[PDB]
From a paper:
β-Lactam antibacterials, that is, penicillins, carbapenems, monobactams, and cephalosporins, target the penicillin-binding protein (PBP) family of transpeptidases. In Gram-negative bacteria, inhibition of high-molecular mass (HMM) class A and class B PBPs (PBP1a/b, PBP2, and [name]) is typically lethal. We used high-throughput X-ray crystallography to explore reactions of a boron-containing fragment set with the [name] [name] (PaPBP3). Multiple crystal structures reveal that boronic acids react with PBPs to give tricovalently linked complexes bonded to Ser294, Ser349, and Lys484 of PaPBP3; benzoxaboroles react with PaPBP3 via reaction with two nucleophilic serines (Ser294 and Ser349) to give dicovalently linked complexes; and vaborbactam reacts to give a monocovalently linked complex.
Residue numbers in the entry: 57 to 191, 212 to 493, 501 to 561
Write the structure that this text describes.
């Protein structure tokens, strides 16, 4: 068994993220080692093993012709042991992974097990590509991720800082190229150092962006509005009366977060994030039109990325949608999603209504993608989301230094097989979008409206650095 050199994983610009490092494994023929017992204590010490524990192992395995003494010493230490020239003691050249960016890209890249086989992340998803063929040994193949390590560092730092400053324990941030479907960053907190998994807590190893399923709440109101503007029955200057901030449908009451409104135009329904206003539109156009937009932008659908235990969530269908179910779909409690799905959906909206498949590998030839929302409707909804960020009473903390930005805040409700998440989903620049981003901050109470307050500022700082690192021309003009 002659171990193969595992393929290099790089970022999209060739920066190393996972590198095969030479190590030396030692195995022994007991019966041959048995001829040199006065050497055993100097061998044991050079192995970092206990004199008597080492001797027992040789004696107790006297019946075997093969045992491992030690796996993955450094090549130096390996030479040190071999230079003792003890009978029965053979070396295998192995490879161990080094992760130059460590905790910063831990969940995306993942790690290898004792046998140098992928256990998590890309290491597992592309295991065959990376592994090559043991011996003639064929070396594994190089893989360039979609991840831009510069954006990844910025995302990791700003999400970590925001969580520490606001007492929060956990969260995620996804950045996508809306044109290419490329995941430019995916960071989760807490994180772990894949180069040192000794103390590693299972909590730190959760790939939240792909695994945590939640009712996305107000962040899907834009998809309800997209269905409205595609129906033929609604234009932006149309008015809905949402007074007095509540709507009774049989036994159920729809309640608005802000109840200071009567007439709202469709932009105002998104700025105020009125559940009554989006519900009244939903009753008029029918739940099926909304369900169809949400399905077409990938909400509650397989991502196709091959991450182990990535979740699909759920977009329930009905033959008949009663009023309560229609309303709860329209304002985001009738489905459950992951942060990756939500970012993919915002990417479609930002890309003038064209969905492009998700990729965690560098995209050279962009797929054709699917026109899921008309360019006219996508353009209209982009302008409405720019007002959500820019207009009076809007999400001003999402405003991006030097650019126009667009998006929607929300309170998500955790789904498990409750607890809450503070969301901000958006894209920039607002008039010619390039990047879509979702920030998820885990929260114990529902109140506070922490989407606008803690997630939005992370969006502001990360979107600003991302656009500049990508040389996107500022659209805040002199």
């Amino acid at each position: 068994a002659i171990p193969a050199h595992r393929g290099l994983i790089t970022d999209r610009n060739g920066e190393p993220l996972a590198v095969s490092t030479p190590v030396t494994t030692l195995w022994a023929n007991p019966k041959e080692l048995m001829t040199a017992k006065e050497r055993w204590p100097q061998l044991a010490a050079a192995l970092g093993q206990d004199t008597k524990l080492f001797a027992d192992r040789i004696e107790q395995n006297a019946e075997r012709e093969f045992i491992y003494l030690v796996r993955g010493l450094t090549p130096e230490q390996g030479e040190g042991v071999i230079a003792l020239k003890v009978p029965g003691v053979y070396s295998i050249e192995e490879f161990r992974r080094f992760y130059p960016a460590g905790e910063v890209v831990a969940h995306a890249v993942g790690f290898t097990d004792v046998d140098d086989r992928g256990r998590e992340g890309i290491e597992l998803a592309f295991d065959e590509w990376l592994a090559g063929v043991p011996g003639n040994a064929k070396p594994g193949k190089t893989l360039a991720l979609s991840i831009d390590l510069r954006l990844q560092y910025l995302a990791h730092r700003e999400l970590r800082n925001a969580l520490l400053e606001n007492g929060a324990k956990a969260g995620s941030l996804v950045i996508m190229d809306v044109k290419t479907g490329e995941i430019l960053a995916m960071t989760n907190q807490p994180t772990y150092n894949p180069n040192n998994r000794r103390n590693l807590q299972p909590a730190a190893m959760r790939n939240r962006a792909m695994i945590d399923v939640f009712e996305p709440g107000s962040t899907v109101k834009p998809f309800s509005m997209s269905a409205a503007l595609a129906s033929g029955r609604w234009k932006p200057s149309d008015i809905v009366d949402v007074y007095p901030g509540t709507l009774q449908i049989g036994r159920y009451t729809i309640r608005d977060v802000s109840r200071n409104s009567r007439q709202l135009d469709l932009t105002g329904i998104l700025i105020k994030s009125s559940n009554v206003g989006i519900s009244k539109i939903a009753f008029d156009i029918g739940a099926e039109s909304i369900y169809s937009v949400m399905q077409q932008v990938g909400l509650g659908q397989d991502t196709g990325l091959g991450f182990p235990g990535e979740r699909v969530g759920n977009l329930p269908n009905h033959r008949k949608w009663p009023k309560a179910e229609t309303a709860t779909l329209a304002y985001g409690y009738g489905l459950s999603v992951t942060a990756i799905q939500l970012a993919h959906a915002y990417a479609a909206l930002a890309n003038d209504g064209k969905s492009v498949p998700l990729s965690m590998t560098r995209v050279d030839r962009v797929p054709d993608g699917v026109q899921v929302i008309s360019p006219e409707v996508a353009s209209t909804v982009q302008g409405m989301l720019q007002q959500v960020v820019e207009a009076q009473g809007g999400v001003f903390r999402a405003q991006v230094p030097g650019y126009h930005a667009a998006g929607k805040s929300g309170t998500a409700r955790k789904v498990s097989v409750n607890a809450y998440r503070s969301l901000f989903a958006g894209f920039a620049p607002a008039t010619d979008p390039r990047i879509a981003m979702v920030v998820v901050i885990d929260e114990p109470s529902k109140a506070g409206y922490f989407g606008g307050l803690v997630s939005a500022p992370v969006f502001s700082k990360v979107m600003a650095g991302a656009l500049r690192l990508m040389n996107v021309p500022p659209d805040n003009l002199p």
